[PDB]
Design an enzyme around this catalytic site. Sequence first.
Site, PDB file in Angstrom:
ATOM      1  N   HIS A 199      37.517  36.794  41.878  1.00  0.00           N
ATOM      2  CA  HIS A 199      37.633  38.203  41.551  1.00  0.00           C
ATOM      3  C   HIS A 199      38.562  38.913  42.535  1.00  0.00           C
ATOM      4  O   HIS A 199      39.261  39.860  42.172  1.00  0.00           O
ATOM      5  CB  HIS A 199      36.241  38.824  41.566  1.00  0.00           C
ATOM      6  CG  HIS A 199      36.267  40.253  41.167  1.00  0.00           C
ATOM      7  ND1 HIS A 199      36.287  41.278  42.044  1.00  0.00           N
ATOM      8  CD2 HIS A 199      36.318  40.841  39.972  1.00  0.00           C
ATOM      9  CE1 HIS A 199      36.324  42.427  41.408  1.00  0.00           C
ATOM     10  NE2 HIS A 199      36.337  42.190  40.150  1.00  0.00           N
ATOM     11  N   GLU A 232      42.195  38.320  41.553  1.00  0.00           N
ATOM     12  CA  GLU A 232      42.582  39.144  40.417  1.00  0.00           C
ATOM     13  C   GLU A 232      43.151  40.489  40.884  1.00  0.00           C
ATOM     14  O   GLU A 232      44.134  40.961  40.317  1.00  0.00           O
ATOM     15  CB  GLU A 232      41.393  39.280  39.465  1.00  0.00           C
ATOM     16  CG  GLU A 232      41.698  40.047  38.192  1.00  0.00           C
ATOM     17  CD  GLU A 232      40.484  40.609  37.466  1.00  0.00           C
ATOM     18  OE1 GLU A 232      39.370  40.056  37.633  1.00  0.00           O
ATOM     19  OE2 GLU A 232      40.649  41.621  36.751  1.00  0.00           O
ATOM     20  N   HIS A 233      42.554  41.081  41.933  1.00  0.00           N
ATOM     21  CA  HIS A 233      43.053  42.311  42.536  1.00  0.00           C
ATOM     22  C   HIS A 233      44.419  42.100  43.185  1.00  0.00           C
ATOM     23  O   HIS A 233      45.319  42.910  43.001  1.00  0.00           O
ATOM     24  CB  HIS A 233      42.077  42.874  43.577  1.00  0.00           C
ATOM     25  CG  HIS A 233      40.868  43.516  42.994  1.00  0.00           C
ATOM     26  ND1 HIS A 233      40.620  44.869  43.118  1.00  0.00           N
ATOM     27  CD2 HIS A 233      39.833  42.995  42.303  1.00  0.00           C
ATOM     28  CE1 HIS A 233      39.481  45.156  42.528  1.00  0.00           C
ATOM     29  NE2 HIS A 233      38.977  44.021  42.022  1.00  0.00           N
ATOM     30  N   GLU A 268      42.196  46.005  49.881  1.00  0.00           N
ATOM     31  CA  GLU A 268      41.407  45.773  48.671  1.00  0.00           C
ATOM     32  C   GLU A 268      39.944  45.544  49.030  1.00  0.00           C
ATOM     33  O   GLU A 268      39.048  45.734  48.208  1.00  0.00           O
ATOM     34  CB  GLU A 268      41.860  44.521  47.911  1.00  0.00           C
ATOM     35  CG  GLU A 268      43.024  44.736  46.958  1.00  0.00           C
ATOM     36  CD  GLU A 268      43.057  46.022  46.142  1.00  0.00           C
ATOM     37  OE1 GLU A 268      42.421  46.076  45.071  1.00  0.00           O
ATOM     38  OE2 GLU A 268      43.740  46.968  46.581  1.00  0.00           O
ATOM     39  N   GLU A 309      33.169  48.781  44.549  1.00  0.00           N
ATOM     40  CA  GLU A 309      32.853  48.307  43.207  1.00  0.00           C
ATOM     41  C   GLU A 309      31.414  47.816  43.131  1.00  0.00           C
ATOM     42  O   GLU A 309      30.786  47.934  42.083  1.00  0.00           O
ATOM     43  CB  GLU A 309      33.750  47.144  42.800  1.00  0.00           C
ATOM     44  CG  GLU A 309      35.037  47.575  42.135  1.00  0.00           C
ATOM     45  CD  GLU A 309      35.871  46.380  41.719  1.00  0.00           C
ATOM     46  OE1 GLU A 309      36.162  45.535  42.597  1.00  0.00           O
ATOM     47  OE2 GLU A 309      36.192  46.281  40.519  1.00  0.00           O
TER      48      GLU A 309
END
Lengths: 438, 55
Positions: free
Chosen positions: A49, A52-53, A122, A129
Amino acid sequence: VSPKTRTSNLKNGLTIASESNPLVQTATVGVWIDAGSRNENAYNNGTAHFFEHLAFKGTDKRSQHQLELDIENMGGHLNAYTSRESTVYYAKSFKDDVPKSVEILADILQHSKLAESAIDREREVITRELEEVNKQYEEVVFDHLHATAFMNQPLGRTILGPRENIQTITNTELRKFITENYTADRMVLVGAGAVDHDALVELAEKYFSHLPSSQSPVPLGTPIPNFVGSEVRLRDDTMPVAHIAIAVEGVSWTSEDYYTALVAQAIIGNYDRAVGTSRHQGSRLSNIVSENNLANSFQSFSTSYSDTGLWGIYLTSENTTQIDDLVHFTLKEWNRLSTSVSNLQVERAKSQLKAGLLLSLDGTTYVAEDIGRQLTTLGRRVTPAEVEAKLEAVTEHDVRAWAQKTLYDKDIALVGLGPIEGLYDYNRIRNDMSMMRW
Amino acid sequence: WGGFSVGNPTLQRFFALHYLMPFVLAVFALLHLIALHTAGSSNPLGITSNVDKLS
Ligand code: HEM
């Protein structure tokens, strides 16, 4: 009769799969990868994940800003998602912007910077999140459902990963993950809509030819999960709506019972009080629930993985004093899959599914998702004729045999969120998985 | 006694009342349970159980 899905390979082992539609003007091209969070261990859980960022944070050539501009100039958009077993990166564009989009996707996948400065930036975005998924109740429920059903196993892990890992993920382990997993034999380049197959194969030879091959190339959609009957209760009296999921161990993509389980799922079906037609549905549970106002909605699911699945139902209800009735009547309808179903329900559900499996594919993105999913789980696109034959082969008596070994008197995984005081203890729920009268 | 000492009249009336009294006792047993049902059972900690009930 839809146009045939063309399939080619490269030398490295990259599959190219395409379905052209000369009636549309847009094209979805993308890369489906047979890899996801399940490929992480406990220490690097969250890496997939995280990547992906950073895939959109800049490459060796284009900076983050140049990347933004290049896509803006193309006119379409890029999108990505990481699941437990599958990663997707696609680009929707105009017909003649397809070579640009393939080039951008090839760049972000192979030649991403993963600069320490961007990792650090990030690391906060992703931390935030963790505290905002909390609102997406369905996602909360399904993530706890996996966590408990596959307790302490790779499928039980979340995609985001724990807070601790987010703080400690390095560019080294990011690089290692994508080098080990994003190999040519695990990847499918997919084109749907206004794409020429021969053009797409050439673009693949130009951009994806220097992809690593894995040491031991297994076929696409190659995997032992040990289901745990268990419950998670997240009681919150301040919420107005209860969200409840109940599941049993379901079927894998390549199970012989794959279609049997889909038919069983369609017999229970879905319900939503906000849809006008839902009060008139044929499903027995739908009738019970609507007549008695037991729920706002329910949704049957049959989720598949490479080596296991979850089959069950997701319920939402404001009727906090009749949660017991809702759950009771739901599990009694499941009991009837074992005891009572005949050709009447089965032939009805088969009729509904024969269309449903085709209806779902209504835009280029849905078509690309279908090609990509099937190629990465089954190793091939199954033609509608084959699917029609497999559905037709399901008899009432296959459904009964399947339900008797999969549902009847079996352990469930149960997650309740919200005002769930009325949800009885595990035993009383699990006792409804059989009928003393039968 | 139904007489000047314990005798036959006493025995016969004790039989009739011994038969009856368990039915009266059953009624009062039911009444004390109905009365209890407003608060529910207490528990060994002496605290409320409204927070954590079991069928
Ligand atoms: C025929 C005789 C009796 C029967 C069948 C009976 C039955 C029961 C039952 C089934 C309960 C609920 C479960 C339990 O706590 O054990 C209960 C509770 C209770 N009984 Fe009795 N009982 C009888 C006599 C008595 C007597 C003689 C007293 C008091 C002097 C009494 C006072 C209570 C009280 C205060 C409770 C509530 C206890 C609590 O849960 O905190 N009962 N009884």
